[PDB]
Design a protein around this ligand. Structure first.
Ligand SMILES: Cc1c(CO)cnn1-c1ccc(F)cc1
Length: 209
């Protein structure tokens, strides 16, 4: 059972602007996603200080980067606090309405796409390199859910029947045909060392066959 939703008009406007605008510094998507994972790990660590039982779904706090050349996917896994169904559908989009408005006024004022994180909508930088994005997430107070969007004004949400995750978020980037450079180990190492060197959680870079 798959539910289809329409993005808010401002979010769809931001996505199409990210997909259509000519901009070569595409590597900044990895900094935003890792930064998002770092915030989710911070939130579950703080909540667990006043409630140790919130770590019963997993004690490890880490981030994993997993490239797959066969499927042409780049996956960012974190064991953070995760997102509920309400987050995926209306909560995160309501917050992002003001950040999108402010971000686009700055763009016409002289700003560039690389400061998208300062407006809280850095997740959508994934569509600099992805034709489709899948998000598997599991929050302590909800079930596991699968979010997916190929832009175009709509996204879907369903109950995930895959491998149970325990707790956290998994972002699967289905890369455009000409962006396969972000599957190479030496390229991912280079971006992480340049933009995410001081993240306070272990970042493990998987390798392939
Ligand atoms: C938005 C996002 C992603 C996707 O980049 C992964 N974890 N999170 C996240 C989830 C919950 C948070 F409180 C903060 C960040």
């Amino acid at each position: 059972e798959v539910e289809t939703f329409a993005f808010q008009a401002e979010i769809a406007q931001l996505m199409s602007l990210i997909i259509n605008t000519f901009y070569s510094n595409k590597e900044i998507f990895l900094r935003e996603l890792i930064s998002n994972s770092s915030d989710a790990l911070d939130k579950i660590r703080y909540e667990s200080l006043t409630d140790p039982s919130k770590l019963d779904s997993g004690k490890e706090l880490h981030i994993n980067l997993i490239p797959n050349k066969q499927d042409r996917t780049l996956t960012i896994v974190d064991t953070g606090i995760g997102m509920t169904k309400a987050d995926l559908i209306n909560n995160l989009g309501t917050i992002a309405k003001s950040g999108t408005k402010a971000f686009m006024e700055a763009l016409q004022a002289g700003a560039d796409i690389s400061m998208i994180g300062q407006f809280g909508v850095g997740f959508y930088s994934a569509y600099l390199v992805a034709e489709k994005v899948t998000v598997i997430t599991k929050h302590n107070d909800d079930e596991q859910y699968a979010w997916e969007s190929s832009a175009g004004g709509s996204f879907t949400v369903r109950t995930d029947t895959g491998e149970p995750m325990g707790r956290g978020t998994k972002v699967i980037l289905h890369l455009k045909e000409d962006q396969t450079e972000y599957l190479e180990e030496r390229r991912i190492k280079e971006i992480v060392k340049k933009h995410s060197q001081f993240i306070g959680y272990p970042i493990t870079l998987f390798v392939e066959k």
